[PDB]
Structure formats: structure tokens, C-alpha cells
XYZ file of C-alpha atoms in Angstrom:
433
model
C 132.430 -221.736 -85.522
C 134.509 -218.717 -86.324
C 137.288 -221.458 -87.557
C 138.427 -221.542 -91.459
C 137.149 -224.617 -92.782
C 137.451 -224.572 -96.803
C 139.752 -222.631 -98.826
C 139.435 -222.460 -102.805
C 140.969 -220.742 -105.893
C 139.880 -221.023 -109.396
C 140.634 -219.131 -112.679
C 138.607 -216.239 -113.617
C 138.606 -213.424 -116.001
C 139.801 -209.582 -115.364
C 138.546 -206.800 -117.477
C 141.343 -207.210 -120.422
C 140.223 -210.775 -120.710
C 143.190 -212.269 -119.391
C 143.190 -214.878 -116.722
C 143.640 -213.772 -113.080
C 141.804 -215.891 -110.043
C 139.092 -216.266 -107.404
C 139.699 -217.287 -103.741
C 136.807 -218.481 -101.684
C 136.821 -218.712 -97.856
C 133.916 -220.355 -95.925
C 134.372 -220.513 -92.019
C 132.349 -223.539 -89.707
C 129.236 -221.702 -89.517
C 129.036 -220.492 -92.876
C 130.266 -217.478 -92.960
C 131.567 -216.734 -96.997
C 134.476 -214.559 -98.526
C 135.509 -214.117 -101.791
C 138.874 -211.867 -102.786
C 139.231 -211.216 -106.331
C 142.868 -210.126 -107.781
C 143.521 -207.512 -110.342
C 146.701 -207.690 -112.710
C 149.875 -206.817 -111.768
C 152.542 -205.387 -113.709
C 155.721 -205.885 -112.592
C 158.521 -202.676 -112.671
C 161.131 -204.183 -110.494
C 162.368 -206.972 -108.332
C 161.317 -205.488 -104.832
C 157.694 -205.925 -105.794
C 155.422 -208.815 -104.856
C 155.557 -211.083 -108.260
C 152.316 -212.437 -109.730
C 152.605 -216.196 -110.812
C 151.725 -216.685 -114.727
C 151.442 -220.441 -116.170
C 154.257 -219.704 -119.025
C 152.638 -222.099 -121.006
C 151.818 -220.038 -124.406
C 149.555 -222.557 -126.057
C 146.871 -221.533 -123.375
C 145.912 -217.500 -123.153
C 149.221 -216.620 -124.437
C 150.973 -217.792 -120.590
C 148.957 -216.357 -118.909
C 147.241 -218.196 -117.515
C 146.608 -218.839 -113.305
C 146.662 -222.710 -112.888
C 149.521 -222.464 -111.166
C 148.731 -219.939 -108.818
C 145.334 -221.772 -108.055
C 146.912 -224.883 -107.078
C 148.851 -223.121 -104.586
C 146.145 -221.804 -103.265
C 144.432 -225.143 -103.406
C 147.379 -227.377 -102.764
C 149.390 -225.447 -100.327
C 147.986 -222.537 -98.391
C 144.601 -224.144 -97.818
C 145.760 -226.804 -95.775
C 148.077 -224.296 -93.720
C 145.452 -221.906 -93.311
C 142.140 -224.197 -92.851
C 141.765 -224.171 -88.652
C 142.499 -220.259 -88.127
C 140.010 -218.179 -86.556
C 138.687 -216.307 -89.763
C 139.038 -213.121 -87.943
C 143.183 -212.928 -87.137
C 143.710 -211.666 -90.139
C 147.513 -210.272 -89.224
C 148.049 -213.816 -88.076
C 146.937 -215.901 -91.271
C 148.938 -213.163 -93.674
C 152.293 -213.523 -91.724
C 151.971 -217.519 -92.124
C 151.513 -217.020 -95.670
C 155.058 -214.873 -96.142
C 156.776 -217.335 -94.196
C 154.883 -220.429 -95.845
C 156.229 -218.358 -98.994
C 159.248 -218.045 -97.570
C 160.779 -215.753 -100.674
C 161.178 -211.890 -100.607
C 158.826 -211.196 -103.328
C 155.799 -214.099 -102.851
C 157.120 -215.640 -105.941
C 156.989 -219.279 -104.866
C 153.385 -219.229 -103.693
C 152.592 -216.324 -106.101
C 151.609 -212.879 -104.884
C 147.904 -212.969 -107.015
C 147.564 -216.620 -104.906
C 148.537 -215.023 -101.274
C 146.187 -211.680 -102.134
C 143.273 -213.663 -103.081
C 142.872 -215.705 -100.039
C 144.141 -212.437 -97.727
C 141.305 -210.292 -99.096
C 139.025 -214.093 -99.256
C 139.707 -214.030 -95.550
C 138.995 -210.207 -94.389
C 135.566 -210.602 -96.387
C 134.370 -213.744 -94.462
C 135.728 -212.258 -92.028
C 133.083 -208.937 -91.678
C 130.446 -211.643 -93.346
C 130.764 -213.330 -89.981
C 130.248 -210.938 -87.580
C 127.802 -209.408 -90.306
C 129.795 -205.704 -90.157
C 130.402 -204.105 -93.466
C 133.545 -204.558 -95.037
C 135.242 -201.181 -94.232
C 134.213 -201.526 -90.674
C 135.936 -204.558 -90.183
C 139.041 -203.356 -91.196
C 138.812 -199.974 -90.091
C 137.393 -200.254 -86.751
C 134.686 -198.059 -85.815
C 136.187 -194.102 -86.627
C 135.674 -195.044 -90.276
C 133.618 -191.853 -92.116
C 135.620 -190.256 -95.114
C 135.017 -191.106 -98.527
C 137.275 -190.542 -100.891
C 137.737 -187.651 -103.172
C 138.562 -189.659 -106.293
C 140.967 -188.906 -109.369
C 139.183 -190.044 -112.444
C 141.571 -191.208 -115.519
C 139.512 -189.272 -118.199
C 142.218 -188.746 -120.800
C 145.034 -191.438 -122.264
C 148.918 -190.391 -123.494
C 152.165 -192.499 -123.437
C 151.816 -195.947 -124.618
C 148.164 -196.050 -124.110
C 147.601 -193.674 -127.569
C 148.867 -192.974 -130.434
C 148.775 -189.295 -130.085
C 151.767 -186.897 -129.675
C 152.017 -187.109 -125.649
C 154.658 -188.234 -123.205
C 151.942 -188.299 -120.117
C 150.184 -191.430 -119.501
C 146.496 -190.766 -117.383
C 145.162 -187.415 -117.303
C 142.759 -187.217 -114.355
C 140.393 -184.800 -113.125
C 139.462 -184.586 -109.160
C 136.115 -182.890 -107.966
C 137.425 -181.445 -105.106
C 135.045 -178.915 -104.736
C 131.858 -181.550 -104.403
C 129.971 -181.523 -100.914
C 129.207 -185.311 -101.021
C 131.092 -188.272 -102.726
C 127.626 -188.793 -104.467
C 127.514 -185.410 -106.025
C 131.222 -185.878 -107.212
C 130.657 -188.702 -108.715
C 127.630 -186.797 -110.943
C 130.525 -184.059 -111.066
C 132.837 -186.520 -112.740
C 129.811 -188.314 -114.868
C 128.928 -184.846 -116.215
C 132.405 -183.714 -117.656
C 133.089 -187.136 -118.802
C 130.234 -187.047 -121.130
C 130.525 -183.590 -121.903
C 134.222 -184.269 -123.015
C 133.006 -187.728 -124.789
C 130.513 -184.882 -126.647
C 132.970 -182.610 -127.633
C 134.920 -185.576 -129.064
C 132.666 -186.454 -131.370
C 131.981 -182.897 -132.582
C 135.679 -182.457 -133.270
C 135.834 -186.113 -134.890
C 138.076 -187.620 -132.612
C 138.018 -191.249 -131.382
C 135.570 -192.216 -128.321
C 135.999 -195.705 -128.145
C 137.577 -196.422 -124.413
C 140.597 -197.580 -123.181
C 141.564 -200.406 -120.047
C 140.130 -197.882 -117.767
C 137.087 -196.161 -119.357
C 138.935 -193.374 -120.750
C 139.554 -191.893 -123.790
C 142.994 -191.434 -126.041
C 141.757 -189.486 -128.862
C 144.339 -187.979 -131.488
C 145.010 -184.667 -130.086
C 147.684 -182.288 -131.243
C 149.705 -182.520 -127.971
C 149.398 -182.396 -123.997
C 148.329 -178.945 -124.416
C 145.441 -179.641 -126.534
C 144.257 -182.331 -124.257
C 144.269 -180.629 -121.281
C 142.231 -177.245 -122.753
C 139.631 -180.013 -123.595
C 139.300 -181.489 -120.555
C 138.949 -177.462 -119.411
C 136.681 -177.380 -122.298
C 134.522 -180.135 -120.717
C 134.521 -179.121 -117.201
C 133.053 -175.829 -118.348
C 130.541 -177.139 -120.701
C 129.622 -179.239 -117.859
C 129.014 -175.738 -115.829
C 131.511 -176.655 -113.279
C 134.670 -174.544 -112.014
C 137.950 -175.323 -112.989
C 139.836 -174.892 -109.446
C 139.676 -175.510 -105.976
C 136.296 -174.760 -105.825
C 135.150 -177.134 -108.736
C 137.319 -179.411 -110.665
C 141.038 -179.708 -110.831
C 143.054 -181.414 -112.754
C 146.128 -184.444 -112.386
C 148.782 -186.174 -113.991
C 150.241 -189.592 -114.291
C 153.254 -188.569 -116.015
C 154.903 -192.536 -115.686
C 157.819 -190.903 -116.695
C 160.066 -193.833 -116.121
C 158.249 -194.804 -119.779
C 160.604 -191.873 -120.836
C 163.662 -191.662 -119.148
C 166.543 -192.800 -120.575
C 168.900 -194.303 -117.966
C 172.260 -194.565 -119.919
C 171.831 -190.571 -120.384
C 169.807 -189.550 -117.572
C 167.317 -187.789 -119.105
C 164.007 -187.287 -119.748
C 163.038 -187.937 -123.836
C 159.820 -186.743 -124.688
C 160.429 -188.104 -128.291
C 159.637 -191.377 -127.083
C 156.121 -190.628 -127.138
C 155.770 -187.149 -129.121
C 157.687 -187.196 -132.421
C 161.148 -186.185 -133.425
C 160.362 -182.021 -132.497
C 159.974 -182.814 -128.877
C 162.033 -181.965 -125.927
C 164.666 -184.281 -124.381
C 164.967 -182.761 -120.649
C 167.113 -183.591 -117.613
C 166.076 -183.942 -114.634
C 166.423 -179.888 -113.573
C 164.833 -179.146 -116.620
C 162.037 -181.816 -115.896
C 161.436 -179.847 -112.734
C 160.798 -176.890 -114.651
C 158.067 -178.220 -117.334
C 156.070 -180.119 -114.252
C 156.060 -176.521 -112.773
C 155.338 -174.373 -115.956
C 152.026 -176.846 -116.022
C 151.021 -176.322 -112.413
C 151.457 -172.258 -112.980
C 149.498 -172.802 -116.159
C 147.025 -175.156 -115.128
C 144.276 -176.017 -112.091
C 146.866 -179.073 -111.162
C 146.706 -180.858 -107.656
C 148.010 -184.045 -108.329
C 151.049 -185.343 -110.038
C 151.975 -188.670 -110.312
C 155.596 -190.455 -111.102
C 156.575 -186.593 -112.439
C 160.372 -188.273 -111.783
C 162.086 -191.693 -112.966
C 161.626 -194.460 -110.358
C 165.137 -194.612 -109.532
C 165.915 -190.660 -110.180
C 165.787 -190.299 -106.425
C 167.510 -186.428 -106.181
C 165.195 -185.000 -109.219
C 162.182 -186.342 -106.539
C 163.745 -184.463 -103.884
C 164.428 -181.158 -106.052
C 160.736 -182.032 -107.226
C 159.593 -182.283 -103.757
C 161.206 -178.567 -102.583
C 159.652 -176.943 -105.727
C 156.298 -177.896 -105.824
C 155.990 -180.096 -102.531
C 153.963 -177.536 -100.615
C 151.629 -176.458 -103.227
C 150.882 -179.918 -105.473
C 150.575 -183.692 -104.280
C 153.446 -185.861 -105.351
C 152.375 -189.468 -105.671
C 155.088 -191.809 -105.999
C 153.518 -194.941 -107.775
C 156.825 -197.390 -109.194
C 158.923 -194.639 -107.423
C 157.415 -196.800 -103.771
C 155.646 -199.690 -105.247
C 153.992 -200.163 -102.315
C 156.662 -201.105 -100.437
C 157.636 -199.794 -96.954
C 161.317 -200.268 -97.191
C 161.279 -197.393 -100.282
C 158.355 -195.610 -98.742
C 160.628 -195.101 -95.376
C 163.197 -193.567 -97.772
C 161.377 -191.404 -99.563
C 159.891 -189.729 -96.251
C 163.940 -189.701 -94.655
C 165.063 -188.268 -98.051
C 162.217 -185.814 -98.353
C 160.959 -187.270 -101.733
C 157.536 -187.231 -102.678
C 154.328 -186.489 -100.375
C 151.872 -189.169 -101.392
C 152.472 -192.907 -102.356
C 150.029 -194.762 -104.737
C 148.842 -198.346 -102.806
C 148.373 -201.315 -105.141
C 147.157 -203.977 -102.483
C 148.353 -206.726 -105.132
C 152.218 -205.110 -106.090
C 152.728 -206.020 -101.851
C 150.290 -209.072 -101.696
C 148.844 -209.203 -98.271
C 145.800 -206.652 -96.565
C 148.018 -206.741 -93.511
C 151.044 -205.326 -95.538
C 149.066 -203.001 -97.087
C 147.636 -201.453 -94.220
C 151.050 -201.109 -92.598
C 152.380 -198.500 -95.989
C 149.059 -196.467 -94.908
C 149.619 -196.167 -91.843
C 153.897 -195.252 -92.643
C 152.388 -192.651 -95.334
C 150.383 -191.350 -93.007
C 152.398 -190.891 -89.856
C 154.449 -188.859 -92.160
C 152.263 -186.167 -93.464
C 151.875 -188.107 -96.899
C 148.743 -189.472 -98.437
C 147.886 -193.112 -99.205
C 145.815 -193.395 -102.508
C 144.346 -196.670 -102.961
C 144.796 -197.584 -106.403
C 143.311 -199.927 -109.229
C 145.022 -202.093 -111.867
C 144.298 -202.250 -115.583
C 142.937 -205.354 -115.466
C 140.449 -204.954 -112.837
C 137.850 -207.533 -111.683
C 133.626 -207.017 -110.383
C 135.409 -206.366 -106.835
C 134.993 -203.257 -104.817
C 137.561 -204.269 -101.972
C 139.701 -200.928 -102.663
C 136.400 -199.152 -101.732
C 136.152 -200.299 -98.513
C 139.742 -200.133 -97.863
C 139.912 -196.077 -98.845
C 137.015 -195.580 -96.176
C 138.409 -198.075 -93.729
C 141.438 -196.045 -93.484
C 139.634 -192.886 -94.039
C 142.482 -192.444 -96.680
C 140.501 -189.307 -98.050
C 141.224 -190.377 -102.013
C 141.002 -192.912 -104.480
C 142.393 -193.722 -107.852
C 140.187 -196.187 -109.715
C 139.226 -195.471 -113.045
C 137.296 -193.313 -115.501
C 133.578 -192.845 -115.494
C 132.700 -196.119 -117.949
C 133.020 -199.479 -117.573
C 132.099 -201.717 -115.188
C 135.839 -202.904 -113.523
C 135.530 -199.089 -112.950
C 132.307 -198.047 -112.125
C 131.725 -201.151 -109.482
C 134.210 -199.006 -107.052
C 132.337 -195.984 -107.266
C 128.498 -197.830 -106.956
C 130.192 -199.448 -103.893
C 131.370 -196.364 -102.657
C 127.708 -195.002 -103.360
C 126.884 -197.785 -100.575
C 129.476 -197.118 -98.053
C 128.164 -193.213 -98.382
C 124.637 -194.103 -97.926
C 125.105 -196.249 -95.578
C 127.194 -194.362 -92.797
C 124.448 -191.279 -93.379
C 125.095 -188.520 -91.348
C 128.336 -189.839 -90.105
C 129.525 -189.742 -93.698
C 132.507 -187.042 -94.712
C 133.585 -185.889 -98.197
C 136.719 -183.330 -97.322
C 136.992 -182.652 -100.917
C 140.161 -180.000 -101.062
C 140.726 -180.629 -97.401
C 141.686 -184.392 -98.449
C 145.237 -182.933 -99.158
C 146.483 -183.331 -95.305
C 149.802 -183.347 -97.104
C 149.261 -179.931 -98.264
């Protein structure tokens, strides 16, 4: 009744257009899950590997037949006959039925898809919400999200070494009033965009990457916005993050960090001490709470000199500095590195996984932000998972766009629908602070 009986993957679309895939999970009496999967980049080999076709006649090779066919082929058959509900049980016997370090047999987009397939029946069956079922019953805070609103690095053309520049309304009451918080600046800046001519077409993630003049220049606009919205900038409003990805710009033969990568031949070419240093002049000269990947992924003493400067006064997320893995996570709490890891369910593959680098984070005074991809699907499974685990933030996207926007309308849900049991800690989210 409760028993698996179909399993079935099929190529779909994420938000860049590019194949990704679908798993669907139907148990004896009918109970139904689907798990979409997001893209995953890939920085290194201790990271759960997505399976792409290869064959570049079809969607340049990327393409998910392969992946689906596992799914269809391979796991179905093991999995079909387990309870839908042991969830730790069904993820284990995909590893091992994977058998490889990195899911890259099976295919980490095929394992995630039916892991998140299964959770989904799973709460359909016993007719619980989604973060209930994976939370148990102590779930109540929503997330206090960081919301990508401006584009450097790679993603722009303008003169800036910093990939995402986010702003967090930590000073909201309610998730629902942060979100009209966020909404508000984000069409104020789009406003002053156009006034100053600058480009407001979107990026992957709903934000902009107009031509500014440098980081400085962006980050006084988003100031601009957040005032002409008629909000605070500071603890008591709006605040402001970075993801630096700053292993776009370090060069590992010289060990050090060139901003003329990204910002013309003028621009500063720092080591790691020195790196220190800038991420600090910006947090004296700027509302900043969050920083993300300020230090290389493998730069593992700058993180710790990072750590004792700023540690107690910013959050340090390390994103391709943990990959959401538990074996670098347990290092980087050892080695004092970091105070915050960024969790991409789909870089680790499994919910079970997953749930085990929150909990780690956690039990060490760091912060688990659940995270979105850049090619993002209609699912809102990241949602339930930063309320299941009462994580306290969230990382998914600017304010357009739908692969965006579906996280926060589900989150709009969860809110409503734990009512007076719902909690938004806004500033108080920082546990790690």
C-alpha cells in the first residue's frame, strides 16, 4: 500500500533551456512524487557528477537520455518494493547500487531525481506537507533569503571581479513582508536603471548586470534602490552580500588573487593577506552580512585568516570551498575556516546526504543555506527543505523569473500555512554570529 510500485525518468527542460530530467514515483495506493533536478556545475572531482549524453548533434551533449535510462533501466527495478517512506534506506541502496565515489555511473541528476521523487510521494501519502515530512513536527522558521539582485564576474561585461551581489531583508517581521521588501528595491533599482540608461534585461537568475563603472558603483545603486524603496540600509532594514567566486580569479601558479581577470588592466592583483584586507575595507564601508567564496576553494589558510578577521562580525559561506560535502565541511569546522556552507542538494545527490551536511553545519555553530542552481526547474523542493530544517536562510534567486520566484510563492505557502506557528528571525537567523 505504502510499497513503491513504478519508478520513471524522462527529459525535461531547466530554465537555460538545456536538458535536465523528471523522476516520477507512484506507491500501491496511489500516492505520487515528482523530483525535478537543477544543473550542476561541476568545480572538482569530490562532487557528485551529473551524467550528460556527450552526443553534440543533440542540444550540444547535453542532453539526459542517459541519465533517464538509469533511472528507468537500473534504479527502478532496485528500488520498486520499498516502503515509500524509508527514505535513508532507498538513498543508501542507490550509492551502493552506484557503487562510485562521485554517483558517476548511475549519474548524480538520475539518483537526485528519484531521492527527492521519493520524499514527495512520500508526504503525498500520508498527505503531510512536504517540509513536515522531512522535518518532523518542530518545523516553523522561514528563511531570511539573499536575493541575487546585481551580476559581476563572468556573468557581465562590466568592470567587476564579484559574481552575485545580494541583498537580505533582515529587518522584515514576516517572510511575506520580506519578500515585498525585496520586490520593492528590485524594481526600484530596475527604475533607476533605466533612468541612467543602463541594461535591464535579466540574467540566469532574474538579476541584472548592467555596465557600471566598477563594484563601487554597483553597490551605491543597490544603496540607491533600497532607499528609494524607503527602506533602511542595515540591520534594521536591508543589508547587503557578496558572492565573490573568487576561485574565477585566483591564479594558482602565483597564488594570488587577479582582479584584472574581470576589471581591466588598472585593477589590483592581491594575495591572499591583501585579499583579507579589501573583503574587510567593504564590510567597514558597507551594510555587509554575508560573504560568499571571499577565498580560493583550495586557499585553505587565507579562509582561516578570513575566518579570525571578520568571522565574528560577517557570515562566511563556503560554496566550492565545501561543495556540499561532509568530508571538507568537517575540515573547515576542525581548521576554523568559514562559518556557513552553501547546500546544493544536487552537487551531493541524495536528500539523505544532504540533510546529514545540515545537521554537521549546524552542530558546529555554522549555517546551512539551501541553495539554487542556474538552471533551475518549476520545483520548490529547496523551500521545504530550508523550513524542514528550520535552516533560517535561503539563497534562490532574484525577484523575476519564474525558476526563481516559484521558491518564494512556495515559501508564501509554507508561511501561510503554519500561521501562528510561523517564525521569520530576520537578523537573529545569523546563529553563527
Amino acid at each position: 500500500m505504502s510499497i513503491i510500485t513504478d519508478v520513471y525518468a524522462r527529459e525535461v527542460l531547466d530554465s537555460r533551456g538545456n536538458p535536465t530530467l523528471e523522476v516520477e514515483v507512484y506507491t500501491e495506493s496511489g500516492a505520487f512524487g515528482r523530483g525535478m533536478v537543477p544543473s550542476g556545475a561541476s568545480t572538482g572531482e569530490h562532487e557528485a557528477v551529473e551524467l550528460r549524453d556527450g552526443d553534440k548533434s543533440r542540444y550540444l551533449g547535453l542532453g539526459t537520455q542517459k541519465a533517464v535510462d538509469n533511472v528507468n533501466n537500473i534504479i527502478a527495478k532496485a528500488i520498486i518494493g520499498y516502503d515509500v517512506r524509508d527514505q535513508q534506506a532507498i538513498d543508501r541502496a542507490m550509492i551502493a547500487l552506484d557503487g562510485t565515489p562521485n554517483k558517476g555511473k548511475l549519474g548524480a541528476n538520475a539518483i537526485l531525481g528519484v531521492s527527492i521523487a521519493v520524499a514527495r510521494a512520500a508526504a503525498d501519502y500520508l498527505e503531510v506537507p512536504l517540509y513536515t515530512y522531512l522535518g518532523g513536527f518542530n518545523t516553523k522558521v522561514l528563511p531570511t533569503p539573499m536575493m541575487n539582485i546585481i551580476n559581476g564576474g563572468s556573468h557581465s561585461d562590466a568592470p567587476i571581479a564579484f559574481q552575485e551581489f545580494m541583498i537580505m531583508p533582515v529587518g522584515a517581521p514576516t517572510f511575506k513582508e520580506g519578500l515585498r521588501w525585496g520586490a520593492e528595491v528590485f524594481h526600484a533599482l530596475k527604475k533607476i536603471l533605466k533612468e541612467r540608461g543602463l541594461v535591464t534585461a535579466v540574467g540566469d537568475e532574474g538579476g541584472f548586470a548592467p555596465k557600471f563603472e566598477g563594484t563601487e558603483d554597483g553597490v551605491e545603486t543597490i544603496l540607491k534602490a533600497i532607499e528609494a524603496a524607503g527602506y533602511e540600509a542595515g540591520e534594521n532594514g536591508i543589508m547587503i552580500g557578496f558572492d565573490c567566486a573568487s576561485s574565477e580569479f585566483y591564479d594558482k601558479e602565483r597564488k594570488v588573487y587577479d582582479y584584472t581577470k574581470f576589471e581591466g588592466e588598472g585593477a589590483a592583483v592581491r594575495t591572499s593577506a591583501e585579499q583579507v584586507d579589501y573583503l574587510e575595507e567593504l564590510v567597514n564601508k558597507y551594510p555587509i552580512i554575508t560573504i560568499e567564496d571571499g577565498m580560493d576553494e583550495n586557499d585553505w589558510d587565507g579562509w582561516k585568516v578570513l575566518t579570525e578577521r571578520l568571522g565574528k562580525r560577517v557570515q562566511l559561506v563556503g560554496d566550492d570551498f565545501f561543495v556540499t560535502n561532509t568530508e571538507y565541511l568537517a575540515r573547515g569546522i576542525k581548521e576554523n575556516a568559514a562559518n556557513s556552507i552553501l547546500i546544493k542538494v544536487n552537487q551531493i545527490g541524495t536528500l539523505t546526504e544532504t540533510f546529514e551536511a545540515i545537521e554537521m553545519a549546524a552542530e558546529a555553530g555554522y549555517t546551512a543555506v539551501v541553495s539554487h542552481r542556474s538552471g533551475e526547474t518549476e520545483d520548490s523542493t529547496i523551500a521545504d527543505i530550508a523550513v524542514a530544517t528550520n535552516a533560517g536562510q535561503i539563497k534562490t534567486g532574484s525577484l523575476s523569473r519564474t525558476d526563481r520566484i516559484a521558491k518564494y510563492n512556495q515559501l508564501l505557502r509554507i508561511e501561510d500555512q503554519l500561521g501562528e506557528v510561523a517564525q521569520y528571525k530576520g537578523i537573529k537567523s545569523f546563529y553563527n554570529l
